[PDB]
Each structure stands twice: as structure tokens, then as C-alpha cells.
Amino acid sequence: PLDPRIKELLESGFIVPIGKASVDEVRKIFRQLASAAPKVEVGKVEDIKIPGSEANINARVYLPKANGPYGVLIYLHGGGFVIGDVESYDPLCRAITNACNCVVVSVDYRLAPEYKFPSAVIDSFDATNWVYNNLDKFDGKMGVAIAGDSAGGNLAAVVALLSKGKLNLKYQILIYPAVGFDSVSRSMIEYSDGFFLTREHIEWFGSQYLRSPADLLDFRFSPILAQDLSGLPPALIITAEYDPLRDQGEAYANRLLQAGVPVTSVRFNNVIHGFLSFFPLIEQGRDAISLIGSVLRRTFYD
Amino acid sequence: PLDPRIKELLESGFIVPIGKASVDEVRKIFRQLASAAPKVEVGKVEDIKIPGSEANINARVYLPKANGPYGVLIYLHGGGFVIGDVESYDPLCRAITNACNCVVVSVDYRLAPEYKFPSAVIDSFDATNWVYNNLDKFDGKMGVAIAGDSAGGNLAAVVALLSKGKLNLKYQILIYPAVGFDSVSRSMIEYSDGFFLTREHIEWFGSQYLRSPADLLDFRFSPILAQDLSGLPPALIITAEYDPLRDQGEAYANRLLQAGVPVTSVRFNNVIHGFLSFFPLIEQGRDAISLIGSVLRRTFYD
Q: What is the CA radius of gyration of chain A?
């Protein structure tokens, strides 16, 4: 069953009312919930402007206290391609930074509904590509990995695919990712209601981001439909037990493993989707952050 | 499915013949297998004698290269209460030392069939107690945690029970633990044969360690039967997806959570029982080691 602490939490109305409130109202509510986390002190934090193919892309750069040279992690936030942003993700990104002793670049990719698919993907790629061609700006001799949660994990996985034969990414980290259309998994059926992320939420997000049903079959939304998953970066995939998106995350893990990509797939029991964003209330989140950090420390510094 | 690497490895043959050879033969084979893992260099390493209630208990003490003061980890090796020892677990204990920047004290508890239940339990408890009362010998200001894998996870869990009211342990880490008797769980049935640890191995070990079937209900062999799990130290429980012991480990995590004890329960997917001992071969082992390390670092230092 659910961790009791998390049942107490849900029963007291901890929620983001996706599809029952306006886009701005839900952005504000998620900002508030995620700002409740403290911000660990790190090194220098600057905001930058990345010259994208279609837009001028804001990113926030976190350096650790540790001296360089560094590995660089591109971090793509979750929020269903509609909510979240650099500011709301700042506590988590700080915490990853201090756990990985690496440079984190949190990308403010363009959001729906104002910008539809595949805009978020194109921004996430263009930022990855640019950061990779400008490591000198970040003291990034040890290379670049990519990470994200919810939609961000989607964008991370898609970026890695798009990067095959163009970029040598060290590593990809998929935190409870969405990896494609799913009307059948057991996790989607059984945890469709009452575990914070709902089937209605997933449907609502797609109503805002996708342009037509044809986009459901496009690999830049459903990476699990990609034709060839071979030679992608090695992966850490984290999954939650009580999460409609569980079974798909684990499917993607298995498919990567089947195409010879090394994957470590970890299911965090007793917890819900999005638990890293609420690490102060859900201790297991701290442990996931620790996993992420110490895996990146190995692959960047031997 | 199984990570393809672990499937090729099991089809190759990768076996300790627990059913079939003599006690000395399987001990010698398990020793062969386990020290094809590299010994990472840590600080000073010495062998000590711990004055137990029934015996002098050998232990190896590993200091990290980092400066103190330290937390201290009591480590209790697996091997079905019959195989394994300090020497076989040396590479793993070194790996943990390095990941935790903490002192590790690996205990050579008495083994079955020469010393039956509850001899292992007693030695593991006496060692824990002695370390806890002699922390000045380890520059151990930051406290004591306890950890173990297979039977060692059983013993670590039990020592934590036995220590309620007596010892303030900071943390327990149970790595694919045996938590009692299980004739019935899906994982036990489904992964009885073909996944390295088999049902026949479990029966055989049981037959060497326990004195009569009454021992099966004794909380010092089946901690999940304990009358009151509340007030135990916070826990990290690691399980393996393709392990007959998986379901019982996750049950213990659930039953601890239900008693108010904080638990991070984490299932490593695609792997088998014992995977940490084989980290050179099973990369996920290295990531589990990092998790353990980073969790101990937060608990002790800060």
C-alpha cells in the first residue's frame, strides 16, 4: 500500500486541480506547492539566453560548490508540457546540483497551450545541442548528460533519440517519464484515480499540447514507438509504484535493455507520481535525489 | 524481463551448487566467485576480536580515506546462514566504505550447520552492542547503523528489533533480506527455479540453520511476525524484481510503514538476488551501492 504519510497527505486535499481550474490558476498552485521546499546553497546561479532555432530559450545555470572541471546535466522540468518552469523547479534543481557536484542547466522550454507540440521538444534539443557545443562556458570537460521528470522525462528520452549520431550524451535520467499513449496498462487502469496524477490529468495535458491524434504516434511524443532504440545513452529510470505511468516507464526500460542499452531501472515503492518535487514531505524523494546524484558522480568522475 | 546481461550469464552457467556438494565445497566455491570483484582501496583495514556473550567474534574494520569523525555501519554478510564470511564479502564492504565515507565493521558471526539458530542472531546482536558502546575506537561520534544482505538482512532486521529500548541505532539497511518463512507468495512461486537463488537452496539453508519447525515462528527468524515493529530505526529496503524473496521483503517494508517507521522501499528491476555481490558484472549493483552510500552520508553527516 501507499506510505501512510502520503495517504494522510492526499486525504488532506494536497492536489493540483488540473482540468478543473484555469491554466494560470494551476500554474500558480503548482508553483506554491513546489516553492515550499527549501533551496540548498550551491555555487554561482545565473540566468542565460540560449539561441534556439525557433526561440530565445531561457535556462538557469547552477554550479556546485566543488571546483571544476565539471560534467553538465541538462534538466527538463515536468508539468504535463503545460505547468512548471525554472522558478518552480529551483529547489529540486539545486538539490540535484549539490548531490551530483555537476553543473545543472534547467531549461525553460516553451509551454502549451501557447506553444504546441513539437515546440517543447525542439527547445529541449536545441538547448542540449547548444550546451554541448559550448562546454567551455561551463567548464564541462567531463561531458553532458540529460534528465527530466513527468513530461520532462519524455523530453529527455526524445532528446536522446534525436541526438543519436550527433551528440555523445554520457547518460539519460528518466524520472517517472511519460513514454507514450497508453489505454491498457494495468497501472493506468488501477491508479487512474486518487493518486495525485490521474488519467483525467494525462488526458487534459494532451488536449493542450497535442495538435491531432496523429501526434500520439509520433516518436517525439511516444518514444517507445521509436523504430531503433540501440546506441542510446546509458539510462537511469525511476518509477513510482502507485502511479498510472509506472508500467510504461518500465516498458521503456525493458525495451532499452532489449536493444542493448545499459539501464538501471528502479521502482520506488509506496509513493506517487511527482514525489521528487515534494521531497520535504515525502522523504523517499530525498533518496531518489541521492540516487541521481551519486550515479552522475560515478559517470562524470570515474 | 531479466536484463539480457544477467540472462546470458545464467545461460552460460553461474552457479553455487547449494543443493548438491558438501558444505566445505559450496563455501569454497562461493569464496572463489565472490573475490573476482575488485577490492577498492580505502583507509586502514584491520581484523579485530569482539568479546561476545557465547564466543569471541571476528570482525573486519574498514576506515574510509576521508577524515573523521565518522558514522559506523555494522555489516552482516549473506550466505544462507551457512556460507559467506568476511573474506568473501571484503570487496563489497570496501565498496560500501568508499560510498558511505563511514567506518564499516563486517562481522564474522557463527555459521550453521556447526552453530544453529540462534547463534548468528546472538553474535550479530553482541557485535552491534559492543560497537555501539566503544565508538571511541572508531572515531564514531555520529552513531551506528546496521546493514546486511540475504540472511544478513534477516539478521540486521532482527538486531534492530532486539535493540529497541537498549540501543539508539540511526538506520537499518536490508538488502534483499529474508524476513521469514514463505510458502505462498507469487515471487517465491514464480522465481523458484532459474534465478540463481532457488527454493531448494532456501530449504536447504533452512534445514542447516533451524533446529525444529517451531523456529519458523520465532520472531528472531521471522521478524515480520514480531508483535510490535513500532519505534524501529528508519529503513532502506532494497529488493530485486526476479528474486523469490522479493515479495517478503516488500511485505516487511509495508508492515514497518504501517507501524510508523519511515521506510524507503526500492525494487531494482530486471535483476536477481545477490546482485550487489556481483557489481563488476551487474552494473545495477554499483548503483545500489551508491544509493546505500549516499543515504548513509545524509543520515550521519550533514
A: 18
B158/B220 Cα distance (integer angstroms):
6
CB contact (8 A) between residue B270 and residue A291? no
Domain locations along chain B: 1-302
User: Sign of dihedral through CA atoms A115, A118, A124, A129?
Assistant: negative
Q: Please give the interface size between A and B, counted as residue pairs whose CB atoms are below 8 Å apart.
A: 84
Express the helix, strand and coil content of chain A in percent, nearest 5 each.
40, 20, 40
The CATH class of the B1-302 domain is alpha beta
Exposure b/e, B174-196, CB count within 10 A at least 16 = b: bbbbbbbbbeebebbeebeeebb
> Resolution, rounded to a tenth of an Å?
2.6
Q: Does A84 touch chain B (CB under 8 A)?
A: no
Distance CA B278, CA B182 (A): 26
Whole-angstrom distance, CA of residue B280 vs CA of residue B35: 11
According to DSSP H, which parts of B141-268 are helical? 151-162, 186-190, 199-209, 246-258
User: By what method was this entry solved?
Assistant: X-ray
Q: Whole-angstrom Cα distance, residue B297 to residue A111?
A: 38
**CB proximity A207 to B under 8 Å:** no
CB-closest option in A4, A263, A295 to B290: A295
C-alpha dihedral (B190, B192, B197, B199), degrees to nearest 10: 140
